[PDB]
Amino acid sequence: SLAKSPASTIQILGAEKALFRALKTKHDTPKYGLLYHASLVGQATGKNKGKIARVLAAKAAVSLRYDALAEDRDDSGDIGLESRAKVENRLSQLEGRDLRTT
Amino acid sequence: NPKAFPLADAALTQQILDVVQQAANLRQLKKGANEATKTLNRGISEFIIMAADCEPIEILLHLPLLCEDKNVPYVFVPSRVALGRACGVSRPVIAASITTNDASAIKTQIYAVKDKIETLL
Amino acid sequence: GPYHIKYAKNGTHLLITGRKGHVASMDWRKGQLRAELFLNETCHSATYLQNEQYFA
């Protein structure tokens, strides 16, 4: 059931109360859901937490689908490990940027 | 790529990729597996195009499960780079969806291809 | 110019008064400016009163 969900839902999976209140009352919607407690989101700071949740949820769907729907999956996590590296690179460059003029 | 089924032949792919280009210019095209997954849930998808060379193929293999559940035609095309260019973007696309619109200017072409994909299934 | 200079009794502050009317009070050791007047007038001399707080 999780594998058949889009990556956007996985981002905000645990925050239905805030989501559907906001959707019906024309206000901004949550951006973290249950993924807020993942390690990668914790490393991010400020608005970068919202971006990494978007990136991490997308890659989680990629890895999760490979877990659910793979007929001859190895019990190695290789797809997850390469997916993890992409998010860390995204975090590194995203955090490297400094808004204040130097 | 045994899992990719049904896989369109060269003659049918050109017809599919022609509609995908026309749909893109009319803003009747949804690009990406995640954005294609939604259209199935909302019941607004004419049919789904998928790329057989996607690696790992499983990242798009949930759509056949959703498509057979909702009775939506789906077909595979050999190349994801070619699919992306047809969609009209600078990145490869592994999945796309044609959105339903009964007032569309390219309705006849979509239904013509849709019939061929049904025969293929 | 020309500039007439007066130091405080304890030597901590310097008072300079330019003839065309530029008067400045400063702590010359710390390079801090306490006051600066640009009186558009002829000024002859200046002095500190009991301490650097007041000057004439």
Next chain:
Amino acid sequence: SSLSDQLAQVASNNATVALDRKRRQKLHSASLIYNSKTAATQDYDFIFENASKALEELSQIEPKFAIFSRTLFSESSISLDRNVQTKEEIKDLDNAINAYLLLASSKWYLAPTLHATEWLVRRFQIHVKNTEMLLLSTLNYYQTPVFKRILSIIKLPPLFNCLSNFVRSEKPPTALTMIKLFNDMDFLKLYTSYLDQCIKHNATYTNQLLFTTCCFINVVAFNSNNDEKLNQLVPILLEISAKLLASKSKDCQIAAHTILVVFATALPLKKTIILAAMETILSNLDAKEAKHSALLTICKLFQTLKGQGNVDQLPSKIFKLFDSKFDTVSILTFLDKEDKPVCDKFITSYTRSIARYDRSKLNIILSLLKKIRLERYEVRLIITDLIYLSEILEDKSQLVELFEYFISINEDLVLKCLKSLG
């Protein structure tokens, strides 16, 4: 200039004089170990006692710290005030401090260095006077909390203006800002002088070289599009590389290899500069690890050559220098490995060198040509010289075998060379 501007210059000169109590509070509050409220309450005896203990711990790690127990960490230094010292004395004091910062550069991870350096901060006010030396020595710790504490208690010099944002900030300076600081030409001259002092004193260490290399490498990258600015980099970074190569330390040599290799790709150079680079690379090549990096560097530099003389034979001195440091069996091993980098232009230059200067090695040429596939024009140049060799040199079994090798591969091209030559 206005009166306020002139008084501003006066204020900077008398920054550390401690004329009143308030000035004492600011100066004495600055600390690398303590917060402002506690630091002001402390006394020079208390600070010195801890520093004396810390220096002993460093002395155990490295004996060279023991010398400062006689000069900077003496009991008589407690009563030493710089403001009352004369110009000659202050100059001697600054030399002693700069020497200390070089040794402590490599031990900032250790806790005792932070206590020992507190004495210099509280007694000699190095954070105000010797500020440039302190920043340069701790530059590679930019992510560490110690560098953050330094930024809080220091007034940045003009050349370190990029770090003003990160003075008293939660986030440490980013790696991208370190590149901007190095990007300036005035700073590079300043860093070049400091790095020269470390080499002269053999005070360099790996973490310094790694951090220095990236910043230099990134500086070339950021100026890649700007060819005019790259030319202004040449006198600076290549001059640094020559200094690094002369150092007996292999890590310094490998750093110079890295700097040369990147820059050669970034801006193709005259062959004389390339040839001069080999003479320096080979002149002091003794370490095995440097020997591995040197060969890859040499092959890459020839790849960048794209003018007439691209594959011409090496000079007699360069060839004689090369073979001694790299025996023929060594390069055959270099060619054997499947992952060898592209080195066709160098082997072509090497091959033509052998025929010119070494007749006994003509058998080696046959092995070399089999191991590496050379370009169409490079093969032609080799055949042309070997045709000359037959007319001048006596016919040999190896010489005809080399021709026979070309008869086997691309028979037609051999005729064209013979047709054009004879």
Next chain:
Amino acid sequence: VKQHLQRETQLKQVQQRMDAQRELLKKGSKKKIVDSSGKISFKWKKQRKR
């Protein structure tokens, strides 16, 4: 149940017109084309999204 269906179609039509307007807000080059019946639609130029 019939009224539920009628409400669904109306909401479907309202959203589609909303989405059509949102596309005009996005970047691109478009030409308004008007039929004899008077229906107004926009045709986008064949330019790849960079």
Next chain:
Amino acid sequence: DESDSGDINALTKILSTTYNYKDTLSNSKLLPPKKLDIVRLKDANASHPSHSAIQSLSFHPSKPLLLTGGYDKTLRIYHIDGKTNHLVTSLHLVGSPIQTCTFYTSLSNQNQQNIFTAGRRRYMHSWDLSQTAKIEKFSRLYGHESTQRSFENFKVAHLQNSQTNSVHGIVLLQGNNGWINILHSTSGLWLMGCKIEGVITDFCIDYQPISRGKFRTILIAVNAYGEVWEFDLNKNGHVIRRWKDQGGVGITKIQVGGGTTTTCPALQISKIKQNRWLAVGSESGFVNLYDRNNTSSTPTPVAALDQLTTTISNLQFSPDGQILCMASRAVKDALRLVHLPSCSVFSNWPTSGTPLGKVTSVAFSPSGGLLAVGNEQGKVRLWKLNHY
């Protein structure tokens, strides 16, 4: 303390003497990757302007002449010197729009010079080369008129008749459904036809030398899908290879470079060379570049250029194959020069101020490094590459 009175300090000494640390590019025969030395010259059409868009441009193989054509139905020849660019002659063809025109010189008889022009018409014109003009019209297809309803897309090449070793020109045309009709350049006779599946979009020609005085002509044709055929015109146009352009869709043009081509024709048999580059354009603006030197049914491209976002309407290499000029007529200023084999787009030129307009024609001079660009406004602008 100091007096002057393999050494390690060799690098330091050479830096002291050398003030310029850059190798002089005058000696080097390979052009720099990212910086292009290009200077503008006087416009070719400035002397006698055109009344339409410049549909086709062509430099004479040997003489310093430039040829222009367009829907104004006029063939204007200019003597390109870079400073005056006066008009040699003009020729109005009544009711004959010009979609493509090109010089042709017989590979054997150098004296024979000819100009072939064509449009959306069922005939073609040839102008042998001043009181009058010798014009012949090709209008007969010898039983194959159904496959060919216009001569508007054509190209001229050299065919060697191996059974006699004689060489002659051929005119290649585009047919209705995948058809390529090959005609004799002089007699006009229909020699052979080549057929591919799908809509034929573009074709190009490659020469492969065999031995002394022998070469073979290959017709490379591509489909809108991206499937590529290769025919041996020396063996009755029989297919010799089939492959697909990786990631190709809506292909628009195909071109070869680095050897003899229509843009870089040869003057004698020994000058025939094989092209080491191949580029395939597309409607999306992508251009896939292939290294012909290094055969498989599915070859991987060396690079996939995507700087242009509109349909590729021109693909042309420099005579030496060191530059690829890809242009689009859809939007203004859409011209890019690509360095080979780096496949990096030049950054300094063109700029925002460079006048190019709706680029519709492009030509490289056989020698001298001149670049001519026509636009919808009817202005042919001329640039010189200082490297050549």
Next chain:
Amino acid sequence: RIHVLKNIHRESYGGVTQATFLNGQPIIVTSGGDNSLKEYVFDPSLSQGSGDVVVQPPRYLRSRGGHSQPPSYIAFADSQSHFMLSASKDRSLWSFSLRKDAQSQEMSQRLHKKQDGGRVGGSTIKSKFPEIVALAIENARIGEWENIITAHKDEKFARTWDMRNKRVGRWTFDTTDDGFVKSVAMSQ
């Protein structure tokens, strides 16, 4: 090597004929055959330590000059004998003062932005305007708008200048008959 100052004086006129450091100063006075005398100054280093390494490159301080080739046209700028306008074969227009040499200045050739808004057509590499064959000046409206007209060699339009601002004006006058400009005049 601290630095190199490229082409401070023309090679065609002898390069740097004389360059002397002022005694005890960071100022160096240079001269050449191009009728120019320049001064350069070494600023103090930007480093608080190691100032000898971090050497600021020399900076232009002041200079005096004139035409490098004989003037082609001259005129009196005002009713008094204060200023004269001179043009030379070196493609420069100068305003020379009889009363004091220091007041002599070179008229700027920086162009004004076009009123229409289109991009002005010219080579990116900046070059001086061609030689001036004729000149015409009035002072009835000095400071209000352009008050000088000049004709150039083998050029099909005339350029305007402004004496008050000492810069080329924003108008260009064309013959409109495909002919070169041979005469320029202004109404009083």
Next chain:
Amino acid sequence: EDEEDIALEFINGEKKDKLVNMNSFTSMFDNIQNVQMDTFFDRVMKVLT
């Protein structure tokens, strides 16, 4: 055979190399901790190659 034919084979002989851009060594700062110089030099070669 002609001199131009010699020139053109030199052009064909030359092969493609990866040019250095701004965003080519920025990731090196990430993995610069507790690493020997030789391994660091190899990574510079890998990106350059």
